[PDB]
């Protein structure tokens, strides 16, 4: 923090964190080499247009104009897509992006937000890098459409997730499908967890990594990121969403009780016995595994309590 990048990078040369190298003194850690076969920088933009029609639409929606379009295609190339034989998947790029974005967003909140405590600050770092919020941001800008992927299940999850998000108006929330009490009225109060696919966040992050590799200007990249995430930055600076379960246990009047998960086929659910305004409401969570079912129940309870307190 004190000495900035081009200087404190050499701190690792001092500490041998990453082994000192005369060829690459640690001070020069911003020299990323995406060597290997995974990338090619020679394909004409015509092939990518054949893979990416309506380029201008995507450019203006993203808010940055690209120069070498191949970076786009390699970033949008989901590994399952077979007919792209010029570039690799996005995994190696999201690997670097995730860190890049964490650093940039953390730097922004550090510089601008000096009134908010470090513990909730790390919680906020975790929530912002969380794939859920990143996926919400991605869908809000409709980038999911162009992703070049060739598997049913991921497409289907994307479809239902965007449907639910639109029903929520592109607002991050407890990702719960309230199946019954607009929910209809029934005997009890049960729901399921809207599952967030991770490929969406992965592709957004790899796209940002492509931006970095293309422009090689980090101020412009931060301009893009700020434009994209400004609403969430303004919001989370007013409320800090900690882990949902930990939110309940700290919340004074939650006191949820989770029953044993009973197994039928591949489905398992947990009976969440809690109380609200001195009356006991029996809510239940569902999932593929025990932890997922517990999280579903907790998210449903926080949903119910949000409607009750507001």
């Amino acid at each position: 923090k004190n000495y900035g990048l081009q200087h404190a990078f050499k701190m690792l040369e001092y500490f041998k964190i990453c082994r000192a190298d005369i060829d690459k003194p640690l001070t020069q850690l911003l020299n990323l080499e995406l060597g290997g076969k995974k990338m090619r920088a020679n394909v004409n933009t015509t092939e990518i247009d054949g893979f990416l029609i309506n380029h201008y639409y995507l450019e203006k929606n993203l808010g940055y104009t690209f120069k070498d379009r191949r970076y786009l295609l390699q970033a949008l190339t989901h590994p399952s897509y077979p007919t792209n034989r010029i570039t690799g998947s996005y995994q190696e790029l999201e690997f670097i992006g995730n860190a890049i974005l964490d650093f940039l967003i953390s730097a922004y909140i550090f510089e601008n937000n000096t009134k908010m405590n470090p513990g909730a600050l790390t919680d906020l770092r975790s929530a912002l890098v969380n794939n859920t919020t990143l996926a919400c941001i991605c869908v809000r800008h409709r980038l999911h459409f162009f992703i070049l992927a060739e598997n049913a299940k991921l497409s289907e999850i994307i479809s239902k997730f965007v449907n639910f998000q639109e029903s929520q108006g592109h607002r991050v929330t407890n990702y719960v499908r309230i199946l019954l009490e607009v929910p209809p009225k029934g005997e009890f109060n049960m729901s399921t967890n809207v599952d967030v696919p991770k490929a969406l966040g992965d592709v957004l992050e790899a796209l940002i990594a492509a931006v970095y590799l293309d422009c090689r200007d980090l101020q412009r990249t931060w301009e893009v990121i700020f434009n994209l995430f400004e609403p969430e930055l303004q919001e989370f600076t007013r409320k800090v969403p900690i882990n949902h379960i930990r939110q309940l246990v700290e919340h004074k009047h939650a006191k949820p009780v989770f029953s044993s998960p009973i197994v039928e086929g591949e489905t398992v659910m947990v009976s969440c016995q809690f109380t609200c305004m001195e009356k006991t409401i029996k809510v239940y969570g569902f999932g593929s595994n025990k932890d997922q079912a517990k999280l579903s129940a907790a998210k449903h309870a926080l949903q119910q309590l949000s409607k009750c307190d507001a």
């Binding site: 990048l5 601008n112 980090l218 101020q219 931060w222």
Partner: peptide
């Protein structure tokens, strides 16, 4: 409108 030039960024560039 105008982004605050990020102090880390404005520092590593100047």
């Amino acid at each position: 409108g105008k982004v605050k030039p990020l102090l880390i960024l404005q520092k590593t560039v100047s």
